[PDB]
Amino acid sequence: QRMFEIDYSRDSFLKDGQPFRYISGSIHYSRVPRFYWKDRLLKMKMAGLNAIQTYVPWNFHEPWPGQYQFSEDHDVEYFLRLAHELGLLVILRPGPYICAEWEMGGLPAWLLEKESILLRSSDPDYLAAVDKWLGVLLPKMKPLLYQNGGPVITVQVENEYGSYFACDFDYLRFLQKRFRHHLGDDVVLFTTDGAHKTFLKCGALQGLYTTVDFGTGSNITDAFLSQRKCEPKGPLINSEFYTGWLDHWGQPHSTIKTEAVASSLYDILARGASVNLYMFIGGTNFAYWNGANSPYAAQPTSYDYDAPLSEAGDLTEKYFALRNIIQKFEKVPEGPIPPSTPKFAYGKVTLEKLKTVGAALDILCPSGPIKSLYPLTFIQVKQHYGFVLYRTTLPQDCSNPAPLSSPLNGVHDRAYVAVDGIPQGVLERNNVITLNITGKAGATLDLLVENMGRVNYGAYINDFKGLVSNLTLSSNILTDWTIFPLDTEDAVRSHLGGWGHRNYTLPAFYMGNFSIPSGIPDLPQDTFIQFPGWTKGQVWINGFNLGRYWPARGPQLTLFVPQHILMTSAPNTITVLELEWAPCSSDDPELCAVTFVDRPVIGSS
């Protein structure tokens, strides 16, 4: 019965023999808690979208080889079902590289266990891991195909491959053959690339339909002409029409005018083009999922994106303006729209210092350290995300300050340095490769190294992390390393072992509790946590990793806190890992505190 195909004769899609054009919005299920999937999807449907687009991040689902996550917030099958049940069609973008301001572009870090791997190429090791991943992911997607009764109408192969240097056409042909093998010969397979022959040159492949992406800054005619070069026949498609843009820590929050998006959307729609709004809701990079760009600049925790639906799912002016545009072309669903969620200001919650990272080494690294003559990377010590502590002793007296240095700029990405429990300051990828330290010969030198996000775009996505090259002290290479991978996630969930197992300050864990009453229909509510007086770190509430805060740089001050991780009667435990400076010294305990507010601050003065 069920068919979805390209009508080449008629520059169109056919959906069960009928002319079809899609109006889609990007939503990433990995950036929205499952609790709220239905809420966002319904808001998307009510805007008049007939389809949604999503990425499948490979590393989100296979964080260790052969160890899969497809349940709860990782249940892509369920997400796709929910979309179908709401009558939305799905454009699937399964990678295996997705870019997406997401850690390493979705690629698993354990691929880097072969140091010389050439990612996104016919490197046989890269291919064997890709093939094994597709043999798991694609048969799950097969019954979700439009023709087998599900919502999936088109599937993207790779992501803007033409923007990458390797230009390996055997890789692309390999992906095509495997996608076909698992999904069959009917499913529409496409590529997406920047709208210019120079990008199309290496990204397009015969047998995969060529689509382009472009934003409100682009000349629409020119963009679609570049697509028409590779596809003289078939529908016009903008796979990523930018509703906003990404951010970086320390840069002003990106915004795009409502009128600019509305007018461009109108013109695209007026050409009979199919179009996807990237992003429709952006959401959040929880835990360590954010990516980065080269030269090294990490994206922050919020992926608000200035999208039509805000980070927390709110209806914005942009949302209504885009809905109004769509209404000019198609009948939008009737009835009231699910609302922006209520937000609640829980107020100030005092914390207190529990333990330094040094003191918690036993619980953080319960299998003990790896010893090495020279430093090893995160990947070599089997750590992908978070922090690794590197330890050695001073091989000479440093009563006078001696330069600690990474001559090849190999601190990836930030190191918090202490000598005998005295913090010495910070080393920084690019910015500061030398730090003066003092202390006695034989003193314990500690470097707490944070992976701030693997680069997700450009040539340097093989971003190893850790001390990736030697450190010197007064110019001599430092040797004899004791290296502790830190299981911060487990440790925080056991309250650093406390619950069993059923200027600068030292990096440390600060904890505090707050209660919310039960039997109140409208509590808990969503909230935003803010860190007045803190500097940089990670935050958990009830062991859920909300992401990184960095009020010292901005633009993001608050972090989003979804209500479903909050409990009533039972105390809610906040854990803060502060890396640089905590406001918790003086008499005043009231300074050692966070505050929950009812409005986000993601773009301050």
Ligand X SMILES: CCCCCCCCN[C@@H]1C=C(CO)[C@H](O)[C@H](O)[C@H]1O
Ligand Y SMILES: *[C@@H]1O[C@H](CO)[C@@H](O)[C@H](O)[C@H]1NC(C)=O
Measured from the CB atom, the residue of 12 and 24 that comes closer to Cl ion is 24
Does residue 282 interact with ligand Y by CB under 6 A? no
Q: How far lies 235's CA from each of 23, 42, 232, 562, in Å? A: 13, 27, 9, 39
Containing 9, the helix (H) or strand (E) segment is none
Residue 60 CB, nearest distance to Cl ion (Å)?
A: 14
Tell me, what DSSP letter sits at residue 337? P
Between 467 and 579, name the residue whose CB sits nearer to ligand Y. Answer: 467
**Any contact of residue 563 with its own copies (CB under 8 A)?**
yes
Q: Identify residue 333 by its one-letter amino acid code.
A: P
Residue nearest to ligand X (CB): 99
Q: Catalytic one among 240, 311, 578, 580? A: 240
383 in contact with Cl ion (CB under 5 A):
no
Q: C-alpha angle 88/94/100, rounded to 5°?
A: 95
Residue 442 φ/ψ region, left for φ over 0, alpha for ψ in the -120 to 50 degree band, beta for the rest: left
Nearest approach, Cβ of residue 334 and ligand Y (Å): 9
**Of 223, 217, 216, the residue nearest 237 (C-alpha):** 223
User: 3-class SS at 143?
Assistant: helix
Q: Report what 17 binds from ligand X, ligand Y, its own copies, none; CB cut-off 5-8 Å by kind.
A: none
Distances (CA, A) of 165 to 198, 263, 302: 12, 34, 29
Q: Give 55's strand partners.
A: 93
305 appears as a binding residue in the annotation: yes
Q: What is the DSSP string of 540-578?
A: EETTEEEEEE-TTT-S---EEE-GGG--SSSPEEEEEEE
Identify which of residues 177 and 564 has a Cβ nearer to its own copies in the complex: 564
Q: Token pair 């301001």 is at which residue?
A: 101
The interface region with ligand Y, picked from 135-143, 159-167, 219-227, 390-398 by CB under 6 A, is 219-227
x-or-dash string of contact with ligand Y, 424-443, rule CB under 6 A? ----------xxx-------
Residue 53 contact partner, candidates ligand X, Cl ion, ligand Y, none, CB within 5 to 8 A by sort of partner: Cl ion
Binding residue for ligand Y (CB under 6 A) from 374, 431, 474, 476?
374
Annotation-wise, does 55 bind a ligand? yes
Give the three-class secondary structure for 447: strand
Residue 571's binding partner among ligand Y, Cl ion, ligand X, none (Cβ under 5 to 8 angstroms by kind) is ligand Y
293 lies in the binding site for ligand X (CB under 6 A): yes
Member of 24, 30, 53, 406 binding Cl ion (CB under 5 A): 53
Nearest distance from C-beta of residue 473 to ligand X, angstroms: 34
Q: Counting contacts by CB under 8 A, is residue 24 touching its own copies?
A: no
Question: What's the burial of 169, exposed, middle or buried (CB within 10 Å: 0-12/13-18/19+)?
Answer: middle
Extract the runs of DSSP E, i.e. beta strands, from 162-303: 188-194, 209-213, 237-242, 274-278, 292-293, 297-298
In angstroms, the CA 467 to CA 455 distance is 16
Considering only residues 77 to 116 of the shown chain, the ones binding ligand X according to CB under 6 A are 99-101
Detail the DSSP E strand segments found in 114-250.
152-156, 188-194, 209-213, 237-242
Which C-beta is closer to its own copies: that of 350 or that of 372? 350
- CB nearer to Cl ion: pick between 33 and 106: 106
240 is catalytic: yes
Q: Does the CA dihedral 29-31-36-42 come out positive or negative?
A: negative
Part in contact with its own copies (CB under 8 A); list of ranges 288-296, 315-323, 344-352, 573-581: 344-352
Binder among 17, 232, 336, 500 for its own copies (CB under 8 A): 336
Q: Of ligand Y, Cl ion, ligand X, none, which one does residue 512 interact with (CB within 5 to 8 Å by kind)?
A: ligand Y
Instruction: Report the interhelical angle of 76-85 vs 124-141 (nearest 10°).
Output: 40
Q: Which of 62, 158, 160, 231 is catalytic?
A: 160
Residue number with CB closer to ligand Y (393 or 470)? 470
Quote the CA–CA distance of 194 and 366 in Å, as a whole number: 48
Is 126 marked within a binding site?
no
Which one, of 25, 47, 21, lies nearest residue 327 by Cα? 47
**CB burial readout 540-556, b (16+ within 10 A) else e:** bbebbbbbbbbbeebbb
| 390 annotated as belonging to a binding site for a ligand | no
Q: Is 599 in the site for its own copies (CB under 8 A)?
A: no
In this complex, which beta carbon is closest to Cl ion, that of residue 96 or of residue 410? 96
Closest-CA residue to 398 (of 420, 379, 372): 420
Is 246 a binding residue for ligand X by CB under 6 A? The answer is yes
CA distance 194 to 26: 17
Contact 319, 309 (CB under 8 A): yes
Q: Whole-number minimum distance, CB 152 to its own copies, in Å?
A: 21
Residue span binding Cl ion (CB under 5 A) among the ranges 46-54, 413-421, 497-505, 532-540: 46-54
Q: Write out the binding residues for its own copies, residues 496-555 only, by CB under 8 A.
A: 515, 517, 519-523, 525
Is 72 a known active-site residue? no
The 13-42 site mask, x for binding Cl ion (CB under 5 A), equals -------------x----------------
Contact call for residue 338 and its own copies (CB under 8 A): yes
What is the edge-to-edge ordering of all strands in the sheet holding 559-561? 347-350, 593-597, 527-530, 559-561
Q: Does residue 457 touch ligand X according to CB under 6 A?
A: yes
Minimal distance in Å, beta carbon 187 to ligand X?
Answer: 21
Is 245 or 320 the residue whose CB approaches its own copies more closely?
320
Q: Is residue 335 a contact residue for its own copies (CB under 8 A)?
A: yes
547 touches 284 (CB < 8 A)? yes
Structure tokens at 396: 């000479």
Asked if residue 251 binds ligand X (CB under 6 A), the reply is: no
Pairing of strands 352-356, 508-514: antiparallel
Pattern 159-178, binding to ligand X, x per CB under 6 A? Answer: xx------------------
Q: Is 60 in the site for its own copies (CB under 8 A)?
A: no
Give helix then strand counts, H and E, for the chain.
11, 34
The residues carrying an active-site annotation are 160, 240
Binding stretches for ligand X (CB under 6 A): 99-101, 159-160, 240, 246, 293, 457
Binding stretches for Cl ion (CB under 5 A): 26, 53, 55
Binding stretches for ligand Y (CB under 6 A): 219, 221-222, 350, 352, 374-375, 401, 403, 434-436, 469-470, 477, 495, 511-513, 571, 573
Binding residues for substrate: 55, 101, 159, 305
